[PDB]
């Protein structure tokens, strides 16, 4: 019910020229959760390149930081009021800071830092949980074993 109201707003992010940073995944998920489905490629081609550009550019600027997520792109984009060379620079800045937070919480790139960050929209808590959950899995499995 609260998820419907979020779906509505998420879906509203593509009306005829709604200045905003729609992320194809979010909308795609809002519909799955709702009960239908719309091709993901079709959403990509309907939306501008803007946010992917921001992401590609950030990846170009430091390949040591792995792939950037749409949510991280949008974040920097909004923060820089649509200014695109400024979004790249802040997008990289924000991601760097995060990679060493995970590092200093015991997860560097060699341990999946980068993929979890991408996969969770640059959200550290959620990356961390995911990462800790992969390693706690044997324990989870043992709860049901013997």
């Amino acid at each position: 019910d609260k998820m419907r109201e979020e779906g509505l707003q998420l879906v509203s992010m593509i009306r005829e020229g709604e200045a905003a940073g729609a992320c194809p995944e979010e909308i795609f998920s809002a519909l799955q959760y709702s009960g239908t489905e719309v091709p993901l490629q079709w959403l990509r081609s309907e939306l501008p390149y803007v946010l992917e550009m921001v992401a590609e550019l950030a990846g170009q600027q430091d390949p040591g930081l792995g792939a950037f997520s749409c949510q991280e792109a949008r974040r920097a984009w909004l923060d820089r009021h649509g200014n695109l060379d400024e979004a790249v620079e802040e997008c990289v800045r924000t991601r760097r800071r995060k990679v060493q937070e995970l590092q200093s919480l015991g997860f560097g790139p060699e341990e999946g830092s980068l993929q979890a960050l991408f996969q969770h929209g640059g959200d550290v808590s959620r990356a961390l949980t995911e990462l800790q959950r992969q390693r706690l899995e044997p324990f989870r499995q043992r709860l049901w074993d013997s």
């Binding site: 706690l136 324990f139 989870r140 043992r142 709860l143 074993d145």
Partner: protein, 82 residues
């Protein structure tokens, strides 16, 4: 009271230790702590046993009451089974 990173050792009936960090609030109850672990890691509250500040932690007790206060404070989680 605001967010605290908590250094947790996790063990079970048999295994090896593992250590994880959790985000908590000193005014959180143990019941709430357990619910959070359930939700993220899938460990039923009923199979969770906690020791915090060198004392077993009960459901209605706050982390605060076990002296939790700063980043890097520690806690101990032991897991029962089936």
């Amino acid at each position: 009271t605001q967010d605290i990173r908590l250094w947790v050792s996790v063990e079970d009936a048999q295994m090896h230790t593992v250590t994880i960090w959790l985000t908590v609030r000193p005014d959180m109850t143990v019941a709430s702590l357990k619910d959070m672990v359930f939700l993220d890691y899938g460990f039923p509250p009923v199979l969770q046993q906690w020791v915090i500040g060198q004392r077993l932690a009960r459901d209605q007790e706050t982390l605060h009451s076990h002296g939790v206060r700063q980043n890097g404070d520690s806690a101990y989680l032991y897991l029962l089974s089936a």
